[PDB]
Amino acid sequence: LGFLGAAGSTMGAASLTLTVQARLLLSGTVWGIKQLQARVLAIERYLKDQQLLGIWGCSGKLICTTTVPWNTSWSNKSYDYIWNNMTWMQWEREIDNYTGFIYTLIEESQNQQEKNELELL
């Protein structure tokens, strides 16, 4: 438990390590110049990840409710069976080559109910 604690723990019931991962993500001469190109990198790394969460209407919640449903092109994985025995490392590898399309799609959908909020009153 701690920094990246419970990394090898359960697939879905290991949510207890979400908060400890988020807190330690930013808070934590020859070296001085290196420190300048060591602290700015840590700053934008946190902001870059926070950029995606902010635009999708799911900033600061650790759950990002959306409207776009699943697509057959990703994979076929059952519920409650793939979610108890599978390495989370391999799960990301399966979608990395096709992960980038989701970011644009959600924002296109996120702007829909953003406009309808004023209309629906």
Partner: protein, 431 residues
């Protein structure tokens, strides 16, 4: 089903990403290794215990060493510029026998700068035979490196002891260390763990002998990708550290020359002790103790007294003789007895002031330490050992700088976090 999607942030996902490392002092006026700009605080690191991770470590391909290799050169070469330089001093020296201190000492004259710009007084100072080189009959004697590159003086207040340091990536990065001493890391580690920052590592410089290294758990490990590799060769981790002692009880005085305005060049004064060359003291049975261990393990990788230890052919002084560094000196020990396949045996050692160790690696002025006024009596451990493959015969080798530091960073790797991930759940609570 009408499956929706959601995003989980802060989930453990990894990626290999070359990046920079910090420094931690973990601890005194100056030091060649800064250890003052480094963050000293290490408040009880967690060393979180991961489990059930089949992670692969690559030891040849790891760039932590390459990142560190450039860092060390930067520290040495940048720590010399803001202090005096030898030049102008490498003029031809009207230099003769010694009038009795003997052997390398060649009491020698300068005929150079005064201090008031113009006058030029004929001062004198000692020098070693290795330092001086011939270009008259036997008086045309100048410095060995004035022909090639400018020469700079070590700055007297700057120390040289290898104060331990720690490296670790900034926030948003993790360090992977697998805690089990059975790995020649090129494949899977199972008992992996995370540490906030690296433990003690001592940046010592030597060749064929790694000193003040890690503490072995009564195990001998040999790590090389291909045991029949034609390039780099065996690297050995030794038994429980062996107490090796070297000393030069040749108490000397310190002379000031004032080579220029506000310069104060320094050189060896004289001898008032006893003419006794530098020597190293290793126990007589320790070398056989470690011998039987590597020998027995060598019978597995290599065909099974057919083991022969022979000296290197030669070609580079930095490789032929073992290199030492204690008390600010730089010994050059004839390593014939260490690798001859063999009380308190005595190992001869010579001393040369000028070293160009940091001129052929990154490129800048050669360094030379000033004499130390006091005794050395430096004692040290030994935990590493290097050999080369030509019945199989082993010879001393190395040469490449990226060898003396591979024995301590084999179990470390920089990894990048990928906290983004997508999951399907039920959704459409919003409009």
């Amino acid at each position: 089903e009408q499956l929706w999607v959601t995003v989980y942030y802060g989930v453990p996902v990894w990626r290999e990403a070359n990046t920079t490392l910090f420094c931690a002092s973990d601890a005194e006026v100056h030091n060649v290794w800064a250890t003052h700009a480094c963050v000293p605080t290490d408040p009880n690191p967690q060393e979180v215990v991961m489990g059930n991770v089949t992670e692969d470590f690559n030891m040849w391909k790891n760039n932590m060493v390459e990142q560190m290799h450039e860092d060390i050169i930067s520290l040495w070469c940048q720590s010399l510029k803001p202090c005096v330089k030898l030049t102008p001093l490498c003029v031809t020296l009207h230099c003769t026998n010694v009038t009795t201190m003997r052997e390398e000492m060649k009491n020698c004259s300068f005929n150079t700068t005064t201090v008031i710009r113009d006058k030029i007084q004929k001062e004198y100072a000692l020098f070693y035979k290795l330092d001086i080189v011939p270009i008259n009959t036997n008086t045309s004697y100048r410095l060995i490196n004035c022909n090639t590159s400018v020469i700079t003086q070590a700055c007297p207040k700057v120390s040289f002891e290898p104060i331990p340091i720690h490296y670790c990536a900034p926030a948003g990065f993790a360090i992977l260390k697998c805690n089990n001493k059975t790995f020649n890391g090129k494949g899977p580690c199972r008992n992996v763990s995370t540490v906030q920052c690296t433990h003690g590592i001592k940046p010592v410089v030597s060749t064929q002998l790694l000193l003040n290294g890690s503490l072995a758990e009564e195990d001998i490990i040999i790590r090389s990708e291909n045991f029949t590799n034609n390039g780099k060769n065996i690297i050995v981790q030794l038994k429980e550290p062996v107490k090796i002692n070297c000393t030069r009880p040749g108490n000397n005085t310190r002379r000031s020359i004032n080579i220029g305005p506000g310069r104060a060049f320094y050189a060896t004064g004289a001898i008032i002790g006893d003419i006794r060359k530098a020597h190293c003291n290793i126990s007589t049975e320790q070398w056989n103790n470690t011998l039987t261990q590597i020998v027995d393990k060598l019978r597995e990788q290599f065909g099974n007294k057919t083991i022969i230890f022979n000296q290197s052919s030669g070609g580079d002084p930095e490789v032929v003789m073992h290199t030492f560094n204690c008390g600010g000196e730089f010994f050059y020990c004839n390593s014939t007895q260490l690798f001859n396949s063999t009380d308190n045996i005595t190992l001869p050692c010579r001393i040369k002031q000028v070293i160009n160790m940091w001129q052929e690696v990154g490129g800048c002025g050669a360094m030379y330490a000033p004499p130390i006024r006091g005794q050395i009596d430096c004692s040290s451990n030994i935990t590493g050992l290097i050999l080369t493959r030509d019945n199989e015969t082993f010879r001393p080798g190395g040469g490449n700088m990226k060898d003396n530091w591979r024995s301590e960073l084999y179990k470390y790797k920089v990894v990048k976090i990928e906290p983004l991930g997508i999951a399907p759940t039920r959704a459409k609570r919003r409009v």
